[PDB]
């Protein structure tokens, strides 16, 4: 069982991007207000697999309970988008709070740029390199979390 | 300017006076030469090294180095530091 935890600003598409993997069918309007665990039974690179993808949602809460919840996230996808840039400014805060809950600098992780017309932020491919993490240039409209699943294995 | 702390076993150590005033028991005993009778040379030499360290690194702005204490002398220096209030 591999527990994954997608994370971002309200509007990035974590709620949607989960639907393509779990249900392979886009939901254009989804409620951005509720988080559930989508368990899956998918062969990955030839293995027994049962993901437990958390679709994070809600108002931020720095509490004991919520820290220990996301600390169980075996891996995170920090989702940002290109329509917005506020997104690309929250991306550091999320990354750093994942290091706090996980008590380490090195946590399986993946920056993800979504919605690829506005293009506020050019491919920061460079930023991801400093983060020491990959990039999937995802498009839920047209989706690789396997990109992230490598890191966790390496761990 | 200079004072002589003398170990139990006859060794004589001439350390600056300001350096030996780092010790409370020495600060009073000097109110010149002192004679410590339960402190062997190898403990007092070590004590005189601490005098040098505290005086040089006290009120420093950047990194200070660790004061090394070997495992063989640890017990004797503790008691001597207790006796000498430093």
């Amino acid at each position: 069982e591999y527990k994954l935890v997608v994370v971002g600003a309200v509007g990035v598409g974590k709620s949607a991007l989960t639907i393509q993997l779990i249900q392979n069918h886009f939901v254009d309007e989804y409620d951005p207000t509720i988080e559930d665990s989508y368990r899956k039974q998918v062969v990955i690179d030839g293995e027994t697999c049962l993901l437990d993808i958390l679709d994070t949602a809600g108002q931020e809460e720095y509490s004991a309970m919520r820290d220990q919840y996301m600390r169980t996230g075996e891996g995170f996808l920090c989702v940002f988008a290109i329509n917005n840039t506020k997104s690309f400014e929250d991306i550091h805060h999320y990354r750093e709070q994942i290091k706090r809950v996980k008590d380490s600098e090195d946590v399986p992780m993946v920056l993800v740029g979504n919605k690829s017309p506005s293009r506020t932020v050019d491919t920061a491919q460079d930023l991801a390199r400093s983060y020491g993490i990959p990039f999937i240039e995802t498009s839920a409209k047209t989706d690789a979390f396997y990109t992230l699943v490598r890191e966790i294995r390496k761990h | 300017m200079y004072v002589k702390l003398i170990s139990s076993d006859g060794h004589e150590f001439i350390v600056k006076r300001e350096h030996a005033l780092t010790s409370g028991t020495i600060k009073a005993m000097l109110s010149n030469e002192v004679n410590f009778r339960e402190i062997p040379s190898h403990v007092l030499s070590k004590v005189c090294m601490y005098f040098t360290y505290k005086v040089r690194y006290t009120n420093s702005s950047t990194e200070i180095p660790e004061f090394p204490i070997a495992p063989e002398i640890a017990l004797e220096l503790l008691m001597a530091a207790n006796f000498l209030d430093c």
């Binding site: 550091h92 805060h93 750093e96 290091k99 706090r100 008590d103 380490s104 600098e105 | 004590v47 601490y50 360290y53 505290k54 690194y57 006290t58 420093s60 702005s61 950047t62 990194e63 200070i64 180095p65 660790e66 004061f67 204490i69 495992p71 640890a74 017990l75 220096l77 503790l78 008691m79 530091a81 207790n82 000498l84 209030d85 430093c86």
Partner: protein, 144 residues
């Protein structure tokens, strides 16, 4: 609780630098003033960490909770970040007293059970048993 971080939510970028030979445990004093532990830094390591205006931090040896100094003082509260430049916190060893250093090394070599098996005067057994814990310093510090 007078010693406590002020919840200001305004970001201040700081650089923790371990110019000590010990593994530093950055300790954050939270909104109610309770010491809250953060990821350790290995000797020689500098990391760019993200704090906020007014937060209080103290720095200790992760293993034995021995006390360390930050910018030559005991507590670190990030100053104003000027034009987005990092605020530097230089964590360093303090000049321990000869007695406290000897207690640090004897606790080092010997299990706590056998402190009483050591041929020392009883006062030293109480001293070796009185380890440093962060909370006692806070109260001491709080008074001043």
């Amino acid at each position: 609780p007078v010693l406590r971080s002020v919840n200001s939510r305004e970001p201040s970028q700081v650089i923790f630098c371990n110019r000590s030979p010990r593994v530093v445990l950055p300790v954050w004093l939270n909104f109610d003033g309770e010491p809250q532990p953060y990821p350790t830094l290995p000797p020689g390591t500098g990391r760019r960490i993200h704090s906020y205006r007014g937060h209080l931090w103290l720095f200790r040896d992760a293993g034995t909770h021995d006390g360390l100094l930050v910018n030559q003082t005991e507590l670190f509260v990030p100053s104003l970040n000027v034009d987005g430049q990092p605020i530097f916190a230089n964590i360093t060893l303090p000049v321990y007293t000869l007695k406290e250093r000897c207690l640090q090394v004897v606790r080092s070599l010997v299990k706590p059970e056998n402190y009483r098996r050591l041929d020392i005067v009883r006062s030293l057994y109480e001293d070796l048993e009185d380890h440093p814990n962060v909370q006692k310093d806070l109260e001491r510090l709080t008074q001043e």
